[PDB]
Symmetry: C4
Subunit: 183 residues, 4 copies
């Protein structure tokens, strides 16, 4: 599963995920499913930022924590938007709102409910993707046009097929359900 992750995502995303996981004390060679999931979330965030006009999104995910909070503080002090309690994934300059991007192998309704109850702020926009082609956004406001989101969903289903053809899909799908049924 580790060699698959290193062959499936580009080395920059792999390096960013390795750094983010070593920061939380987790191991790429052991917790390979979390490695894959973090790589997937990063690729989705980057494709999402690429979906709009050139200057539309400020990328928060993928940065170092302190610098990410610095950019969040700058955005809040210059636009007047409330500071989120948890680090978001993007900022939308066009719609003037923070975006929390989610990718799940689970039920999309349950994941959206979990994230919405975790955020509790009436500002941060939520947008969930899944490996089955479903997506759910705050107020059904999907931010991007249909082409960008469809590309993201196609990439996700391709990742799922690639995992299934080598027999890693079942364990990867049950890993996220294991972190929610245990933690």
């Amino acid at each position: 599963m580790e060699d698959f992750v290193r062959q499936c995502f580009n080395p920059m995303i792999v390096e960013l995920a390795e750094k983010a996981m070593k920061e939380y004390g987790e191991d790429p060679k052991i917790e390979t499913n979390k490695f894959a999931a973090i790589c997937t979330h990063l690729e989705v965030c980057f494709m999402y930022s690429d979906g709009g006009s050139k200057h539309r999104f400020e990328i928060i995910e993928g940065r170092d924590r302190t610098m990410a909070w610095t950019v969040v503080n700058s955005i809040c002090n210059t636009t007047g938007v409330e500071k989120p309690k948890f680090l978001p994934d993007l900022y939308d300059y066009k719609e003037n709102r923070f975006i929390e991007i989610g990718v799940t192998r689970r039920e999309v309704h349950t994941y959206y409910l979990e994230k919405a109850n975790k955020i509790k702020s009436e500002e941060t926009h939520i947008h969930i993707f899944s490996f089955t082609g479903e997506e759910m956004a705050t107020k059904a406001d999907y931010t991007l046009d249909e082409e960008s989101r469809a590309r993201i969903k196609t990439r996700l289903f391709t990742i799922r097929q690639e995992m299934a053809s080598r027999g890693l899909w079942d364990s990867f799908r049950q890993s996220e359900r294991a972190a929610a049924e245990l933690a």
Copy 2:
């Protein structure tokens, strides 16, 4: 003809064509006309995908066949379009449809007829270009704007002229008319 093919198309297209023809058991050095035709079809598909907005098209032609079918499956599952019986060339995320692209040295109406009768799927769009400047699309819906299609046609006619100035056009034009009579 083989040296002409290697000089006329960029090395990435030539590499892709050689890999496809070795996948289908053919020889670039012997059947140089099909070498040229596959390079031409690949170039047309690429200009076509470049004709629209940034990421309007998913490119299926030019891939390993297994990965091509994987991408087709992903598209079909995330959008709901029916899975084609034959590998198409592009997928249009804007109009939500697969595109089969044809480049023919023969009469265009006949080529479109054979393509549409082989596809049978009432969803896969068909777009045919010729070496004379004539094009033909399903429902006269040409997908791209006039300028991109005109660039494609200009490039096709330039290929035809470069072939003819070397005495290679007659054999190339009869290569397709011969394999069409042999298949029957």
Copy 3:
């Protein structure tokens, strides 16, 4: 402060600022605050030119003085616009006007009034940014859309935050105030 400037701005801007300071007889190693100010103004000008269409702005700032005046004369002779008395920072081909860009650590309107009374031109547009998210432009015409200006403001606030975190913001803010009171 010098190391912070060299690690905070990309080497092209740092080199242009070093050239601008050596041309005026100043030393970046000892006048580090003005080093930072020149780097910041250059970055803002370059972000501003990137704010519109690909070929909308002629960049006047960041050149050799003689070549910049040559380009100014060319613009004036081909468009008929009045030649400015001081080198501006940009030329807007869409609105057909020169642009003076300012970045101040004081109030935007004081700086605007000073610059306007200095240039004494009814044609040259003036656009002032601050390190606190405020902006002031001639006739309230901000040239660019909200997204590009918001990007610029966010970057300015991030620079201010980095300075503050290193304990250099106070001296940088009081340096501009100490230079104006000398006149």
Copy 4:
């Protein structure tokens, strides 16, 4: 003048101009004014092709004559537009027409009328720039928006200024008026 040309235009344009001058049996070291003129014309054609959107212009100038005529063949046979009798500079896929671009140190309308009487083509669009900022196009259809043409004119005036600052502008401007009067002499 030759050093100025070599340091004023980017190396690709200098190479193209040298190739064209040798193709016409002329020495860029001796005929430095014509050297600069070819360089300026090529740069203007390239900025012009940039001025539009992505797939608008087929660039004809800058190619060798055989392939240029081959591309004009392809365009005429796939679009139905008329055969130009002389090699034009660009082809506009949006407006579906060939474009002849001229850059003159003389009066713009004099140059336009000379070119339009030479080519005598009903479809070939003509667009003339000068080193003073004047421009003139067929039916006042300038093809590009105002910003692109303004950039072109600004660059032309900058070239004029750089030439005059070096003492080369007077000879450059008298070069074109000396070649036009010579062409009007059958004797």
